[PDB]
């Protein structure tokens, strides 16, 4: 995260760290949506252009963390994966369209003060909250500039008008994406960066006071560049796929 600040303890209890066993390294962010399921960006697992193609046994899921590098004994929980599910129509060849994947853990995680799932949006919540100008929150242990942070970083960003998103890049944008960030004249700044991918873009409903994950950190051109914006996977647009996978595979 660029231009963000340290998260408070227990601020994002659904934040998950995708950790590579060997070498031991942070791969991406992710989110806990139930005691057995984790949501992340498909490019974190499969991206042929960089010969990236991880399988269940190559990774570890670390939940309940705050510090990036320390093994938070008695606080975090490390889980193994049972099965990875990548959207059948994930478009890695062109624009990362449908950049989403689900990961089923071997055994349920027990919730605690630091581990708790985020809600997935219903059509109504998505309708009322996903509006240009409304701010969401992004979290992660990724780069601070285009040094990695000591602890989880957080930044609040405004959703941007589709036209503006379209006009800032050469990449073909689809209905399965939305972009966020401050305009160059807006003064404030901030953005996700390397290491943040797969993480959650969440919003707090003013109706029932719950946090909902509206997006997944997907891609950008640089980090916190003026005139550029971060792009996120539109979670609601892909909810039927999510429902399908979960009720079909447990």
């Amino acid at each position: 995260i660029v231009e963000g600040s340290d998260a408070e303890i227990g601020m994002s209890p659904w934040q998950v760290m995708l950790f590579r066993k060997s070498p031991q390294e942070l791969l991406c962010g992710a989110s806990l949506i139930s005691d057995r399921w984790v949501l992340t960006a498909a490019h974190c697992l499969l991206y042929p252009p960089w010969d990236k193609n991880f399988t269940e046994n190559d990774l570890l899921v670390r939940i309940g963390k705050h510090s990036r590098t320390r093994y938070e004994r008695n606080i975090e929980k490390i889980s193994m994966l049972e099965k990875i599910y990548i959207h059948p129509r994930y478009n890695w060849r062109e624009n990362l369209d449908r950049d989403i994947a689900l990961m089923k853990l071997k055994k349920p995680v027990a919730f605690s003060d630091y581990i708790h799932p985020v809600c997935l949006p219903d059509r109504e919540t998505a309708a009322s909250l996903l509006q240009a100008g409304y701010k969401g929150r992004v979290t992660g242990w990724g780069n601070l500039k285009e040094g990695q942070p000591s602890v989880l970083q957080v930044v609040n960003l405004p959703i941007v008008e589709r036209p503006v998103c379209k006009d800032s890049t050469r990449i073909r944008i689809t209905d399965n994406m939305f972009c966020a960030g401050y305009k160059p004249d807006e003064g404030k700044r901030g953005d996700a960066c390397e290491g943040d991918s797969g993480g959650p873009f969440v919003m707090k409903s003013p109706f029932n006071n719950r946090w909902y994950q509206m997006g997944i950190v997907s891609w950008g051109e640089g980090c916190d560049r003026d005139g550029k914006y971060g792009f996120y996977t539109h979670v609601f647009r892909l909810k039927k796929w999510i429902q399908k996978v979960i009720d079909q595979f447990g």
Binding site: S5, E8, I9, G10, M11, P13, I33, F111, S112, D113, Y114, H116, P117, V118, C119, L120, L129, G133, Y134, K135, G136, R137, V154, N156, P158, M203, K204, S205, P206, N209, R210, W211, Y212
Partner: peptide, 26 residues
């Protein structure tokens, strides 16, 4: 029980910047 944080919502404590989010939902 999703989306309600043990250290915040469940205790009725606000985090330091959540107000900024709520203030944007005009």
């Amino acid at each position: 029980d999703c989306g309600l944080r043990p250290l915040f919502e469940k205790k009725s404590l606000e985090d330091k910047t959540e107000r900024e989010l709520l203030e944007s939902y005009i």
